[PDB]
């Protein structure tokens, strides 16, 4: 009586149940694991807070309306302030982590709409100015708020044009990245497990984000007659196999 459909994920002191899942994706078919010695470089023993950092943090909720263009969060940024995960983050020189991402959106059998939930490794954004204008730090570190693709261009911020993925590629091809759809008629959640993907064994958690999670409405939300025209979307994310190394004074970052 197991269905692909019902699932339970327990991680730390927190549990999620979905009764309307559509399997789960594990990026590149690899599950998060700690850093092996053969791959290690820094000689420091690392710190593995385990259950105090590897639990589920639910970010603040978004509201899908007929005019929504899509939202974008960066990792580990989105979690920069969650509990002890965040403290560890500002206090060590280097850290490394994988995540379980669970995006939630329920409706009824009269609604229609379909969101794309995708994880993009190394999502370098484009400046809407063109040329070689850079995208300032603050703009690519929105924190739990994430970036709202239907917000206005700002100065020093990225471009927010959806048919171009914020980088000069077409929305249609985002499907080459680990992703899952939430089609109100099928699905009510999306779950993706992200292994740590980098060109170095461990890195800085503040100067470099290693994935952007993106939720994009593709088939517009259509509510039943005289229904309220909107649904909330909630994102809950859990660091998994986290390791921190090179402890010290506590980083100070712009803004």
């Amino acid at each position: 009586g197991y269905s692909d459909r019902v699932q339970q994920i327990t991680l730390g002191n927190s549990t999620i149940t979905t009764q309307e899942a559509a399997n789960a994706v594990v990026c590149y078919a690899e599950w998060p694991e700690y850093l092996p010695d053969v791959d290690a470089s820094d000689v420091n023993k690392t710190s593995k807070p385990d259950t105090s950092v590897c639990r589920f943090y639910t970010l603040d909720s978004k509201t899908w309306t007929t005019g929504s263009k899509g939202w974008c969060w960066k990792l580990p940024d989105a979690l920069k302030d969650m509990g002890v995960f965040g403290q560890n983050m500002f206090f060590h020189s280097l850290g490394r982590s994988g995540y379980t991402v669970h995006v939630q959106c329920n409706a009824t059998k009269f609604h229609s709409g379909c969101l794309l939930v995708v994880v993009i490794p190394e999502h370098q954004l484009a400046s809407h100015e063109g040329g070689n204008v850079s995208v300032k730090y603050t703009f690519t570190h929105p924190g739990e708020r994430g970036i709202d693709l239907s917000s206005a261009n700002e100065v020093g911020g990225p471009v927010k044009d959806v048919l171009y993925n914020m980088n000069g590629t077409l929305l249609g091809n985002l499907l080459i990245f680990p992703h899952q759809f939430i089609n109100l008629r099928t699905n009510n959640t999306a779950t993706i497990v992200i292994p740590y993907i980098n060109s170095v064994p461990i890195d800085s958690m503040t100067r470099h984000n290693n994935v952007s999670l993106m939720v994009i409405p593709i088939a517009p939300l259509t509510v039943p007659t005289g229904a309220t025209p909107s649904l909330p979307i909630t994102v809950t994310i859990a660091p998994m196999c986290t390791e921190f190394s090179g402890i010290r004074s506590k980083s100070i970052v712009p803004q």
């Binding site: 990026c27 590149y28 078919a29 690899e30 092996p36 791959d39 059998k109 009269f110 609604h111 229609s112 709409g113 379909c114 490794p121 070689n132 959806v162 048919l163 077409l170 929305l171 249609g172 091809n173 499907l175 080459i176 759809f181 089609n183 109100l184 008629r185 099928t186 292994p195 993907i197 980098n198 060109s199 170095v200 064994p201 593709i218 088939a219 259509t222 039943p224 007659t225 005289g226």
Partner: protein, 236 residues
């Protein structure tokens, strides 16, 4: 001193030849490799992942909406969409498949075309997808369409339908850039019965459509893509 003779071609530089060269950095030790998920070995590995087709090309500036094929409730007998199968041009051209095919001169193989339905769960519909092999015109009505490769799709719990365009061909390779002799057919879709919405519901519903290549597929003779060009060198 051993006697030699040099042949025609001596001193030429062929950008495609593969020979040994002296290393400028004798004895240098590269950084160790660490493990990174995701290694690609063949472009054939990636063109099997499906991506969305902007089938609804009828707009005037690129929009999220050209990915949406609309469906109308209560129409009978009528046609949902049509396209030829020049995978290197037209709707296909910006898709990952289209985009890679363009790095090669010839392609052969089967294509997989699927449609995912997004209408309310309490609605229902039966569509027919038809592949018309080279030699006939794009079908003009379902009767015409239904006499070639087709699948009656019944919209249900299972949200997507995967149609295969089996390789139908005299010549074993076709050109990726559209060519007549080498042309592959048409793909059309019609109401088999009709879309029906539940009460309290209204308007258009949309289908999303994807394209990817079957394991069947072959691409050969690499060349340059018409999809990118430039007028002055870029700088930092």
């Amino acid at each position: 001193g051993l006697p030699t003779t040099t042949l025609p071609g001596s001193g030429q530089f062929l950008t495609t030849d593969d020979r040994q060269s002296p290393s400028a950095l004798p004895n240098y030790e590269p950084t160790p490799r660490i493990h990174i998920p995701g290694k690609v070995h063949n472009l054939l590995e990636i063109i099997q992942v499906d991506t969305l087709i902007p089938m609804n090309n009828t707009h005037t500036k690129d929009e999220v909406n050209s990915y949406l094929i609309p469906l109308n409730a209560n129409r009978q007998n009528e046609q949902v969409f049509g396209t030829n199968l020049f995978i290197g041009d037209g709707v296909f051209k910006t898709t990952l498949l289209g985009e890679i095919v363009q790095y090669y001169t010839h392609w052969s193989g089967s294509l997989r075309f699927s449609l995912m339905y997004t209408g309310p769960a309490l609605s229902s519909a039966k569509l027919i997808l038809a592949y018309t092999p080279p030699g006939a015109r794009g079908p003009q009505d379902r009767r015409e369409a239904m006499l070639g490769t087709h699948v009656v799709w019944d919209i249900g719990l299972q949200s997507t339908i995967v149609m295969t365009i089996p390789w139908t061909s005299g010549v074993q390779f076709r050109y990726t850039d559209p060519d007549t002799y080498t042309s592959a057919g048409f793909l059309s879709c019609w109401y088999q019965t009709s879309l029906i919405l539940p009460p309290e519901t209204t308007g258009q519903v949309y289908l999303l459509s994807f394209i990817s290549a079957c394991p069947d597929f072959k691409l050969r003779l690499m060349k340059d893509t018409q999809t990118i060009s430039q007028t002055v060198a870029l700088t930092e």
